Amino acid sequence: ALGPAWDESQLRSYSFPTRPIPRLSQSDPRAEELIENEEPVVLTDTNLVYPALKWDLEYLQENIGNGDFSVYSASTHKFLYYDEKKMANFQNFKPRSNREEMKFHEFVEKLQDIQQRGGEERLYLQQTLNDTVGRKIVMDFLGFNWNWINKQQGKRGWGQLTSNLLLIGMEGNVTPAHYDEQQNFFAQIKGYKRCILFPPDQFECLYPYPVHHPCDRQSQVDFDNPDYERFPNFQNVVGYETVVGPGDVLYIPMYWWHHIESLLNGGITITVNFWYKGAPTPKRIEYPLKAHQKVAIMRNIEKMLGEALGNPQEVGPLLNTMIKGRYN
């Protein structure tokens, strides 16, 4: 009877309607049906990261090792990421978030400081779990529900687990809408994150940056102020929404757009995700294609032209030449 975990006033306000992602037992056939069919579902009882539910900044500082952690800094609540390698071919791009490597205890002191000095700055720890972690964390990791998630990997024909990303964010932190090219079981550990997903068939409404841009895979649309002149179909976007707290696992299917925010005035959030490579392309192709297969096609066309033209800055002009007065 502990009261409302959170309320609507902690959710940011946006221009589009949503329906709820279903929350189900891991033993419920409907939940298996959704995962099999690459639709989101929040599972409430996997115990996937049960051992980590005691994690907080003190336990982690004490136990997580002397390794380096990538900490992103932002002057705003939106943490747009950028691929550093791609900066070259978009000279007119300055980042809105710096990355800094620091020891875990330096990160905790950073938060303390900002908090104590009423600072505006925001931080977001995002670090792959690795060898360097302490004995207690290794034991917690080994206590994850591998039986369950390994079975899911076998049943969906997925490829290997590529990594586990540890995410520690400040209240109000936003990861803007983007899609990932792997399957993701998103395991909430501390605090609450609002997750807004969009299916791959809404590619037309979300206007991803060019593949060769540093922000490849993110939406160009500012959710806090959509430019309907440039992005008219953003007026047609409909999301699938949920709030995940400790113990919840959100299946975020490959290619599904997701916008993710830590609840306003909700304290720090901790999440560990589980990224798996997708099943291989099927022997025989079934027509017409699924949406994510079309996204795959479009990405490859952009890649190939960048290569063939010898310069990604020519992909736009060639593509426009191809369609104006011909296919539009």
Partner: peptide
């Protein structure tokens, strides 16, 4: 050809 165009990368989060 179709398989060529249907192959996907494995990029996630920050860079890849």
């Amino acid at each position: 050809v179709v398989k060529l165009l249907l192959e996907h990368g494995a990029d996630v989060x920050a860079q890849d």
